């Protein structure tokens, strides 16, 4: 009668990372971009696509 | 904010080759070829083939 069980209690930290990137849009790109949000019979489909 | 993409634009030259060969026809050969253009009951089939 000398044996007893033992339990371990370790805990782990969560830590913290992130991921970032850049993305550029031109003035002509935003200009022809804005009309495709209201795409209709106007705003030419070839340049839009 | 120092990351920007870059695109590469290389173009290829089409170049130009050809291939040539010789091929001879005898006088008897072409003279018999002329009669086979009007192949009929005349111009014998064994010599024609």
């Amino acid at each position: 009668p000398v044996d007893q069980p033992v339990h371990n209690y370790m805990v782990k930290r969560i830590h913290k990372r992130s991921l970032s990137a850049a993305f550029a849009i031109a003035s002509e790109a935003l200009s022809l971009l804005s009309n495709t949000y209201v795409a209709a019979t106007e705003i030419d489909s070839s340049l839009r696509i």
Side-chain angles (χ1 to χ4, degrees), chain A residues 1-36 39-40 46-47 49:
Chain A
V2 292
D3 45 350
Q4 67 269 13
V6 58
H7 278 59
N8 302 328
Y9 312 104
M10 81 305 298
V11 286
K12 300 289 94 176
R13 298 300 296 111
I14 192 67
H15 211 266
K16 208 85 192 66
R17 318 293 197 91
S18 178
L19 281 187
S20 63
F23 192 34
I25 304 297
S27 308
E28 157 198 18
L30 65 94
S31 72
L32 282 182
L33 187 153
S34 315
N35 206 358
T36 60
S46 48
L47 61 83
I49 67 167

